[PDB]
Amino acid sequence: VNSFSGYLKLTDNVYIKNADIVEEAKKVKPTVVVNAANVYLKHGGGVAGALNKATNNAMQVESDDYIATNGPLKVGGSCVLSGHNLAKHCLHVVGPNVNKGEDIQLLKSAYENFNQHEVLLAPLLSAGIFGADPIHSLRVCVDTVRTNVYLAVFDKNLYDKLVSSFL
Ligand SMILES: c1coc(CNc2ncnc3nc[nH]c23)c1
């Protein structure tokens, strides 16, 4: 049993809810929240801008030190940093950005990072400001992630379309 409430069960391991990921993290304080990161960990907008704002910019300060030491992530890659006031850990995952011309085949590699964690609160990778089709992102998630993933989809309209169209 875990603390996640109000989710629709899609599969053995994948759950979904119309919820802003920021407010969900603050309520649950999950072990792992996933950020929709870019390779520079520049948390300007979308999910990343919203979680960084909720940490009062502490996520960005930690991220800048990480990049100064290690250099940029890979598209499809990840790193584990603090969850600050939102979670124990934040898993920063880089899905391909269609609005930068990145290979959508990298979306499966991105979701494979989730398998290193038993339970996660996450957004749909490459959705929102990253330009991919969220229906596709949900299909790759279900077909790639084997650990228990709780998805927070804020756009009520999109949530209803994801559920209605789910095979
Ligand atoms: C209300 C509208 O957006 C938010 C911040 N959370 C958020 N932003 C963007 N994409 C999201 N996906 C889940 N939660 C998200 C709150």
Going from N- to C-terminal start, the domains of the chain cover 1-167
Residue nearest to atom 10 of ligand 1 (CA): 47
Pocket lining: 34 vs ligand 1, CB cutoff 6 Å: no
Cα of 29 vs centre of ligand 1, distance in Å, is: 17
Q: Does the Cβ of 22 fall within 6 Å of ligand 1?
A: yes
149 lines ligand 1 (CB under 6 A): no
The resolution, in angstroms to one decimal, equals 1.0
Three-state DSSP class for residue 31: coil
CB of residue 145 inside a 6 A radius of ligand 1: no
Whether the Cβ atoms of residue 33 and residue 87 lie closer than 8 Å to each other: yes
The approach used to solve this structure was: X-ray
25 Cβ inside 6 Å of ligand 1 = no
SS3 (DSSP) at 135: helix
Beta partners for 62? Answer: none
Phi-psi group of 121: left, alpha or beta (phi > 0 → left; psi -120 to 50 → alpha; rest → beta): beta
Tokens 């520049």 appear where?
42
Q: If you measure from the C-alpha of residue 152 to the centroid of ligand 1, how many angstroms do you get, rounded to a whole number?
A: 8
Nearest to 84 by CA among 50, 37, 52: 52
**Rounded (10°) CA dihedral 133, 139, 145, 146:** 170
Judge contact between 112 and 144, C-beta under 8 A.
Answer: yes
d(CA 98, CA 95) in angstroms, rounded, equals 9
Residue 29: count other Cβ atoms within 10 Å of its Cβ.
14
